[model samples]
Target chain A: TKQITLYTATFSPYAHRVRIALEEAGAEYTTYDVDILRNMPDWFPLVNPLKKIPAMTFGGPEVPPDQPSPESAKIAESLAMLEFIADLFPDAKLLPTDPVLRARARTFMALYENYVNGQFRDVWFLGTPADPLLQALEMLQGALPPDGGFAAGEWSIADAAVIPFLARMFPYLEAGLGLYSKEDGVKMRKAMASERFARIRQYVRDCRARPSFANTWAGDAEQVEAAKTVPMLRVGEHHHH
Target chain B: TKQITLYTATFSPYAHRVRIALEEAGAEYTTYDVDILRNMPDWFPLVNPLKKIPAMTFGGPEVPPDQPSPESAKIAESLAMLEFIADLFPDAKLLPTDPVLRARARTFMALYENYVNGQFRDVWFLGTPADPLLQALEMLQGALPPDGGFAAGEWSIADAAVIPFLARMFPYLEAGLGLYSKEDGVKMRKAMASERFARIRQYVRDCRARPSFANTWAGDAEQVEAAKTVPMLRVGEHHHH
Candidate 1:
């Protein structure tokens, strides 16, 4: 249960989601930041054939992060990694016991992935409309318990699914970080700060209160700095589909 | 734990996934087909505010499908519902007990959702290139165990997540019920039949052999008929042979 190595990078929230889960699970794991954008090592493809970030290897013999063991099980994709963490650390209660509450947690994570997450990407990466993103934010906010607490009443892997992206939202907007226009960015900052999103604002703070989030995250400025390296986030980038 | 109602329609593979899962769980459940495309009931949004098909209400007092009980926990999203089924029916062993095996199961589901599902939507609805979808299929196939089995060793919820979409693939292609060109459809069918995808073909067959799938499916011609009712996929149909 302990031999875990996460191949991740600071620029990726996908990887950061796994990092938070491991912390919350109290798992002893090693993380090697792969500068996936510029200097992706050849060994990366061997670890995750899809060449995606946040790949993991578990129960392998102790070895350097770069030298991943063949004996280990390789796990890919962030959502599955989140569920895997819950399975690995049941004592930590990564998921709820009540069937309904478990559904709440699972549904919360699904809400983000299906609705909010993509809007964040479209706005940031493709500079699509801010209104749709804000609408999505409100829709997700509606799923939360009205008077505080996490997605499932108690914090679970559900919060882990969303916090990384929300944590980055304010910082990225503050730094004018995404491909969205200056107008949209300021509008986003204003809308996010306004009472309209007060629930989500509190939700973000509540998640940040957890050491899982605090430890895994490299504060806003550092995050903004690291995000600067991601070529996709830059403005003036040309694209088709 | 007893009362469960799944709002579903034969036309929807998303809804179909949940029906299969609930059947596999061997729990008594009621199904209501909400013609979400043409004549969605006004009460539809009450169960799922997103207005998505495959909404569920669990553990409430017995009531007719039209009049959903407020006491029940409303669950939306097929993946979340699948997890909820696993949680509710632990005796069925809907998920692997081994942590690593559990990761494999979740990883397989995530691979389908992240890499393959979108490609299906693209090629089928938007007339995107078929090569990308086939490539995605190949990538997903590589994740399965070389030896025959479910996504994990056991028939876990991971299989529930994907069997819906993959099951539709061959039928839809054979019927030429998508936006894809006839040439691309022919290409897709040949590629799927080829040895390159033999593992996935076996996987699909293994899944279909289950009573869960057997019970939920409307026969192939009927499924294609139902799919034709969907506006996005309703433009035309072809079968020159």
Candidate 2:
């Protein structure tokens, strides 16, 4: 067994990804929620030089040690945190062992981070036009497996990494923020409801139904609502969305 | 030896990272440059549904084989490409074997991608104000190892992932596009010129001096200049930066 401490806030989607992964792995870990709205704690920077949440510290002295100084390793970057947890608990099979399969799964992760979720950040925070966000959504809808499976064909890191962003976007789409074209909006609504996005919509349902996600679903909602309270942290800087 | 084909453009720092990694690994690979400004080849999208550069096709038979049908795998996402290459060429030691070290290194890569370079993308492609970019750079400066080393204490994927962006920032800093504050500009210039940024500036010099970077440095310039010609591809959708 390994010692793990995750520095996170409930609202951060990136942090949520790591949380879901840890729970999925059945890893016993501790969480320290950092309030970004309040000035960060002085000690936090030592944990992550970037001073970002979802930072984790792992591998300290065994419990009941004689020495008071129990050294540990600090690791940040939510994606890295997920990978680390997956590696530590390989039985969970959070990622594929096959090199080729892993590459394909990672491609989905990268595409989601760079192209798909990026536009969502813009829409949610900057209130930039949502046309591009709609386009990105359409692109994702097109990429889902025809027969219905996770992004990389089975449950893997790709699904864990991309699910949080999709969860955040769901509420926004439900509100119809006037970001989608009438044609695109109708298409997206149909896909969400009917068979147009059979795979993607199904994937969302399966992911949300998991015990890890279900336990924290309410906290995730609170986080998003709390995010609106601090205007400066919204569009620029961390863009925590 | 496995077959490797990298579909890339010179100006793409993301693609450049892959090229450098391939060279470092002593891997023989073929490059097919894609002209994003012009219409893409019909065959390109088949390789990457995202239609992004730095898409790689690996593990296929050479031409003129007995079987007419040859099946290969396609990997997109620059980070994934780096990991795949590293896995294939373990002898190169592009990534650390220790899970903790790998996680730390990956954190650096993620930090560069999501926080640091994302701001650079805003300044370069979107023509957004430069203050945020300067802040990102300052944050990086503070994070560099005090004594002198790569982000993870050695030449790893983290270094390869971030060097290209720093190289691109160099020219803009030299020109002083009036983006940086007076004090910040002086600090950056001093660091560029002397030992002030002993680690980061030296890392840049060492990275550019490598045979891999030297071979393709000139083309990166051409790609950047050409990018300015197409305003449509700049800031809005799929800036490709």
Candidate 3:
């Protein structure tokens, strides 16, 4: 089969998802950065008709040993592409073979997408906050398991996909006044301090610990400095080329 | 195990997807309809914290023997639920065993959700007929084989999921400004004349063929009639049961 080539940018949580999956899988891959802020070049859409970033080309023979490949097939979308890479590296077992567990994993993503992510958008991005900032804090606090570890076992795609979002958002919530109840947010944050939720927190910390995180995030001094006071939009987005 | 039960309102595309999968699998199940016109019962939330319609219960030691016993536990979310049903009844074969093909199935649903569904929302409910609708229509038409057929061989979950939206909207298009330029929506509709897409159209026609479009659509109409023309609400206040 072909080696994988990943295309991404420095501002997309969606892009970080595929990057982390490849990192976790230890899949041999190359990276291509798309300057999303600039007018995306013409070829980007050719890679993905949707013209989105975090695209990949799986290399091997013109046809993968597993099946015939068509001319220039473009893979896009964060979650689907992650699973594609997961399947490619079966030894990594990014997705569990047990169908039930797999469903649970999908359910976890859907829950995050529909509930946490959806709720996050409902408050911060999509419109004015309907609930208090403390609600956001409480929502995040509650997402951690009672035993507080990662949302799923091992570093499945859910962890790879979700942690970056949570990490990126926390600093913003911290900076924005009225987004949180200092009193209540502190309590909720404290509850998450428990080992059960600590695991979920640790996943973000682990991602930070990885050389990949250092490579993509730590090196961006301008971004890292800018992020300390305000959140770094670049943490999960930039593709390390 | 308990007998599998699916809670759904027939008109919902999300609910319809699950129903089609169970029917195709020939699984014995019962559906409980929540009257969305009224507030959803608090109990539904106990089962599905998200309170989304089409929350499903699959396997448990209590599950009825007549149902295809799953190798695992309860499943939720339409795509995940469909995959569960497909895997349980390998005989039904709704999903491709091939990795790339399976990825394509996932890709198809994502595209439908992103573009095709976006088009319907933009044109039908949200805005004036815009060019994006044509673009989305073109993409959907492109998804069909040049020879014209289902999204994949035989009939797959992607097809079941996509067709209902198309079928529902085609009528609205015919009634007025036309779904798209005659060249666009009509061009895609033309593919339905081809053997592949034709079978699906026929199946849909068959399902809706009788004066009532049969019970399939009868179930659909009963549900839609109940929800339709209800006053649109102020955002969060409008919850679908």
For every candidate structure, what is the RMSD over all alpha carbons to the true structure, in angstroms? Answer: 2.3, 5.7, 7.8
Query: Residue A193: error of model 1 in Å?
Result: 1.3
Q: What TM-score number comes out for model 3?
A: 0.73
Question: For each candidate, what TM-score against the reference?
Answer: 0.97, 0.82, 0.73
Candidates' C-alpha lDDT:
0.88, 0.71, 0.59
Per-residue accuracy of model 1 over A29-108 as CA lDDT, tens digit each: 99998988888899898778878898898886898988888888788889889998898888999988898899999999
Q: List where candidate 1 sits over 4 angstroms from the true fold.
A: A236-241, B237-241
Better of 1 and 2 by lDDT: 1
What 10-residue stretch in candidate 1 chain A is worst by lDDT? A232-241
- Compare candidates 1 and 3 on TM-score and give the better one: 1
Q: Provide the lowest-lDDT 10-residue window in model 2 chain B.
A: B232-241
The residue ranges of model 2 lying beyond 4 angstroms of the native Cα positions read A38-42, A61-71, A171-191, A219-241, B63-70, B172-191, B194-196, B219-241
- Candidate 1 chain B, poorest ten consecutive residues by summed lDDT: B232-241
Clashing pairs in 2: none
DockQ for all models: 0.88, 0.69, 0.47
User: What's the distance in Å from true for residue A72, model 2?
Assistant: 2.9
Q: If ranked by DockQ, best first, what sequence of candidates would result? A: 1, 2, 3
Model 1 clash pairs are: none
**How close to the true structure is residue A66 of candidate 1, measured as C-alpha lDDT?**
87
* CAPRI quality band, candidate 3: acceptable
